[PDB]
Design a protein around this ligand. Structure first.
Ligand code: NAD
Ligand code: NAD
Ligand code: A2G
Ligand code: A2G
Lengths: 438, 436
């Protein structure tokens, strides 16, 4: 598994005259999206399963290294839609044959992190919009190649950050847009999720994800908690942008201890040291001076959390557990949290995002992390069919994912703040913020 | 108020001075105690000290004559003997020190005078117990260390949060290895104090002015104290190494002044520069991280975070919650929280100090009882000639977050190094044990 490390992870040209800034880009309408999947493991098959019941979608091709996973996807589509997609398996470049033969309008890429950028760039160069699982890529050069390829091909490239479509995340966006918590000051983002048992897995994510902990000390998974907070703050879209980040890491102990406790002495995780600090902590500074706490711990034994805290001069909203407080909320007693299902009912009633009210009920029926997956996929289909911009542009996906190489650089440089590259080349200033859709 | 480089700018220990780690003072069967500063906090300490055995409150000093009289009257009504009262000027406490020569003083003045009053008290032969933070600048903190080492008198910052029930229980659990090897801690002081801008009598008289002069963690000790002692920082095992600091925009207090105060008011003509939310990350020598945050402006619930995380579990406060392989059924995917589920955790891990005094401390009160536990330990240590649970170097290290975060912010967030107030002697300093 190719993993850029050291300077190649975070090392570095103006936009070509024939390239287009892709902020707010509207693609031609697709009344029936001819969609292909590249990588149908756990995540890829989940997207496939939900999209075979969506209107205006035709799944034309399915590609995976494993023949039986391709067949599982093909059989699922045939059962639900009455038409079989073409299946491709074998080598890691077999997806190129699918792109050439099917010429899909769009592809959903749910492979491991190492191949996200290459597969998405090839897809766009073959005339397909690229929807890519998190993180968008691993290195700064990979992120720039996705930006530059999108601008050169004028094809959508969107990282599929599903957390922005959670009910609480959508409600907080709605409350922030309405000015409920005043002027924004500070946000807190996290991915706290104990994944240490992946060390005992030889298939699925265990096959590739733990190895990243042996090569990179930094925030390997920064997007889930950050995505919502970045769009609360309108980062990269007119109002503000990521400016700098300083990163810090606790000792790297949990995974070394897990391997010694549960795995044989000759196992590779007992002979390859884990160097990624169990808890990664970073502080982002935006251009307007806001701070974002960003934390990653996918090792320690503790409850799941994404933090999802957004704080302003007139109140604070936070998740895990969902809680709100502010002068305009409830009885206005900001000294205590409004939390729990009973007290929050009036908050949901007043501030539920209209997108959640339109799709969230069916999304809770469909499922996928509580419904956010179905909302996210529905918005992708709606924007493609209506010729409307995506709720997340390529520069946002690149900026959120750049926390991985930038935190690693800061940690390698003793915790010094490092500058964010401007993937928009200054055009962030004229990029319209995400509105409250519908 | 020192600003700029004077806040964080800063000589060998004299051969005749003593390192004060684990220092044991002579026993005081009778403690002659004096109070300097009897506003809200000073009078709270005075009222609780009236029920202590082996304590004689001999003097009370405040700028305001009516506050001195309130303290004197309270001691007479509760203890049956009147202390001498001193008021009128900011150097009148020296007259009390000279006339009474107390064994110890409790200093509850505003931040600006903590270091000077405590230094003078020690030089006049009294142990110095100082409210938070211990001082403001690095030079002031060094002067407290050097004076304590030269006079061989106790200097202790009265960090009461370390004596909360949950904070004492977490200490007990950490000492027993319940959460494995320590990795990370989270400390905070989140408390909306913005209405001090409209108050002229209490802390409003002096505290908001600091927000116009310093951009940094003005109040770093409450959340940090417990986490530092979980990690045995400055006492053998580990030490504060470096810290990088960051601050949100400074908006809340400016907005409050324009909304509630006249245009010619000093808070409408002096800009507030301290970021509403201050965020800093400490690295220890063993490589642990400590998140330290301050927001005494924004409208949100009170919190000190009190999170300590190890390879086998995590303990956290606000709300109190624990999770780990050794805790409950070992299902760390969900918090053990709430009064019902935490009952078994308290039963198994209540700190013996809380079990001995907590029932009386709850009756007494003072931030839930932690104040009475802290004062009881101070008296016990003075009476028995025991070391204080918090030495002068810990108080200096925790308080140094103020000038060090301000310095880091002034340098664009670069990490800045902690001074070693122990001059290397932290390595041979015994960690705080689970005291009975
Ligand atoms: N947004 C979410 O909530 C969420 C949930 C799970 C996973 N993910 C992300 O989705 C991605 C995949 O996750 P996963 O759990 O399904 O891992 P997985 O190992 O189960 O699936 C990866 C699949 O991609 C295939 N693959 C790899 N390279 C290929 C190539 N060149 N051509 C064709 N197929 C290829 C593999 O055969 C494999 O089956 C990861 O980036 C992960 O971080 C996101
Ligand atoms: N640990 C806690 O929980 C806690 C609670 C409240 C206050 N505090 C701290 O205690 C200190 C005082 O807080 P406060 O609320 O009582 O403020 P306050 O303004 O009400 O009390 C300060 C008193 O000190 C007096 N004073 C100032 N300079 C003096 C001098 N040279 N000589 C004699 N008296 C002098 C003032 O007259 C005033 O009465 C502060 O450091 C504060 O941060 C701590
Ligand atoms: C929303 C969310 O947390 N998604 C994550 C996903 O990104 C991946 O890490 C997975 C691994 O099993 O666990 C979760 O589902
Ligand atoms: C333990 C604790 O939080 N103490 C603080 C104290 O330090 C001071 O800031 C006061 C201001 O009114 O509010 C609280 O009591």
């Amino acid at each position: 598994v190719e993993i850029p490390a050291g300077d190649h992870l975070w090392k570095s040209a103006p936009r070509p005259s024939g390239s287009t800034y892709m902020g707010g880009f509207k693609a031609p309408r697709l009344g029936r999206i001819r969609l292909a999947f590249i990588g149908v493991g756990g995540r890829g098959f989940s997207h496939l399963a939900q999209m075979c019941v969506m209107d205006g979608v035709e799944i034309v091709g399915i590609c995976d290294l494993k023949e039986e996973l391709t067949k599982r996807g093909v059989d699922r589509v045939l059962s639900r839609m009455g038409k079989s997609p073409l299946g491709y398996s074998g080598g890691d470049m077999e997806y190129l044959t699918m792109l050439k033969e099917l010429k899909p309008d769009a592809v959903i890429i749910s492979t491991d992190w190492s191949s996200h950028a290459r597969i998405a760039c090839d897809s766009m160069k073959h005339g397909a919009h690229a929807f890519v699982e998190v993180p968008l890529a691993v290195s700064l050069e990979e992120l720039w190649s996705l930006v530059d390829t999108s601008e050169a091909t004028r094809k959508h490239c969107m990282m599929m950050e599903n957390v922005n479509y959670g009910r609480d995340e959508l409600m907080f966006l709605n409350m922030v847009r309405q000015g409920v918590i005043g002027d924004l000051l500070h946000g807190e983002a996290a991915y706290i999720h104990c994944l240490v048992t992946q060390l005992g897995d030889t298939r699925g994510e265990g096959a590739w994800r733990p190895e990243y902990h042996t090569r990179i000390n930094g925030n390997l998974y920064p997007t889930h908690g950050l995505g919502p907070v970045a769009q609360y703050m309108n980062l990269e879209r007119g109002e503000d942008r990521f400016c700098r980040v300083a990163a810090f890491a606790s000792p790297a102990l949990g995974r070394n201890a897990y391997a010694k406790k549960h795995l044989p002495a000759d196992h590779r995780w007992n002979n390859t040291p884990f160097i990624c600090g169990d808890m990664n902590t970073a502080v982002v500074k935006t251009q307007l001076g806001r701070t974002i706490l960003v934390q990653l711990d996918e090792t320690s034994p503790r409850p799941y959390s994404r933090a999802n805290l957004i704080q302003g001069t007139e109140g604070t909203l936070a998740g895990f557990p969902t809680r709100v407080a502010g002068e305009k909320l409830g009885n206005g007693n900001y000294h205590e949290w409004i939390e729990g299902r009973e007290k929050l009912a009036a908050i949901y009633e007043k501030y539920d995002h209209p997108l959640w009210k339109r799709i969230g009920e069916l999304a809770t029926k469909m499922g996928g992390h509580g419904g956010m997956d179905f909302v996210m996929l529905s918005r992708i289909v709606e924007c493609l069919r209506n010729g409307e911009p995506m709720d997340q542009n390529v520069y946002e996906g690149a900026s959120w994912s750049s926390l991985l190489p930038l935190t690693a650089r800061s940690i390698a440089q003793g915790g010094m703040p490092v500058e964010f590259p401007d993937f928009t080349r200054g055009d962030w200033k004229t990029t319209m913020p995400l509105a409250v859709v519908s």
